[PDB]
């Protein structure tokens, strides 16, 4: 089934192609997917951080949890007031739940998710063409006051609606080089205080064990010949292309994708009705259009000589 227990899940660190310093880096706000199928110009953003939940995983609308750069696999919580979405200029935040954000964005060539203040100030920019979307056969900048109602599909602002699911998988190993010492010509295993660390070494032969203290190792002359990770972590993580999978990568659970595409009605402009000049076997249409408008014609006989034109101007 699809669960909403975020105590069983955890955020993670992705590889953003464009961090604040305009270089690839490891980020807590990596953007995985961007969806723009809404007729009102809203987008769905998947982030490696979880929004709307506190550190323990309980629901809290004002808090978001993320993965710290600290070598202890810590989850830190900050206020959602530091989350900024932008494409070319700032975007309006319409909702948040788990890895997902909904934003009303102006057109642009990129999508940026930012932590605008604090110690963990960071950004993630992915390439995405956000264009202007309009409903019907007449262009507009924003929906007019007067017009006709047309069927359009928008992203529901409610986070209790689902548009699918995403698979939760067991967390993989994470080797940290802070657990290696390399004192003089010997390698020492350093667990993080009261934690158990499993090591793997190819110093001549394969050595593995779980330890809680300094370990001298055997025949290990360099620290690159050993790795050390902690198997304490059990909280599920997304199927991300920036994490090394577990030996058992079966689906542990499923999470909802909020902001489902629902049918609604939009307000679309009604153009200036043309003046018809009538002559022998024909008409003239004096057409006034401020923004591109569609003119479709067809003969009602055997051969419909269909014309379709986008008209701007008089």
């Amino acid at each position: 089934s699809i669960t909403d227990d975020f105590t069983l899940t955890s955020p993670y660190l992705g590889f953003c192609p464009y961090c604040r310093h305009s270089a690839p880096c490891f980020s807590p706000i990596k953007i995985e997917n961007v969806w723009d199928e809404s007729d009102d110009g809203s987008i769905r953003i998947q982030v490696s951080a979880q929004f709307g939940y506190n550190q323990a995983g309980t629901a809290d609308v004002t808090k978001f949890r993320y993965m710290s750069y600290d070598h202890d696999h810590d989850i830190k919580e900050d206020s959602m007031e530091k989350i900024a979405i932008s494409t070319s200029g700032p975007c309006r935040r319409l909702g948040h739940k788990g890895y997902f954000l909904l934003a009303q964005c102006p057109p642009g060539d990129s999508v940026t998710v930012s932590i605008t203040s604090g110690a963990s100030e960071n950004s993630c920019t992915v390439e995405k063409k956000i264009r202007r979307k309009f409903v019907g056969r007449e262009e507009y900048l924003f929906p007019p006051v007067h017009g006709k109602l047309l069927k359009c599909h928008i992203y529901d602002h409610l986070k209790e609606t689902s548009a699918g699911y995403i698979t939760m998988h067991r967390p993989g190993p994470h080797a940290y080089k802070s657990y290696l010492k390399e004192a003089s010509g010997e390698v020492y295993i350093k667990p993080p205080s009261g934690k158990n660390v499993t090591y793997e070494c190819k110093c001549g032969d394969y050595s593995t064990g779980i330890v809680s203290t300094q370990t001298k190792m055997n025949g290990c002359t360099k620290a690159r010949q050993c790795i050390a990770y902690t198997r304490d972590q059990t909280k599920w993580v997304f199927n991300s292309p920036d994490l090394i999978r577990h030996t058992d990568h079966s689906v542990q659970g499923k999470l909802h994708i909020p902001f489902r595409l629902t049918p609604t009605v939009c307000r679309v402009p009604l153009a200036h009705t043309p003046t018809v000049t009538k002559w022998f076997k024909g008409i003239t249409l004096h057409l006034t259009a401020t923004r591109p408008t569609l003119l479709t014609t067809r003969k009602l006989g055997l051969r419909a000589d269909a014309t379709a034109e986008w008209i701007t101007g008089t």
């Binding site: 070598h71 802070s178 004192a183 205080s193 300094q214 690159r224």
Partner: protein, 79 residues
């Protein structure tokens, strides 16, 4: 040999310059890191009185780690 677009390990295999003086050991003998002047320590990295770059967790952990022992001196961390 290899082009100036690549930096030669002291092994025979050459990695690109972006991998040299980047804080990561990617030479078998480490000849891509212990030559450049990038001696900076990270935000969370403790600094010995000897100048070595040691993680902050290693400080007063109960066992000497840094060459001069300043990480475990009673003055540097009271016991």
């Amino acid at each position: 040999k290899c082009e100036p677009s690549q930096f030669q390990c002291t092994n025979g295999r050459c990695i690109t310059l972006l991998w040299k003086c980047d804080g990561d050991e990617d030479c078998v003998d480490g000849s891509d890191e212990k030559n450049c002047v990038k001696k900076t320590c990270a935000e969370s990295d403790f600094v010995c009185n000897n100048g070595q770059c040691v993680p902050s967790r290693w400080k007063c952990d109960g066992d000497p780690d840094c060459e001069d022992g300043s990480d475990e001196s009673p003055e540097q961390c009271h016991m």
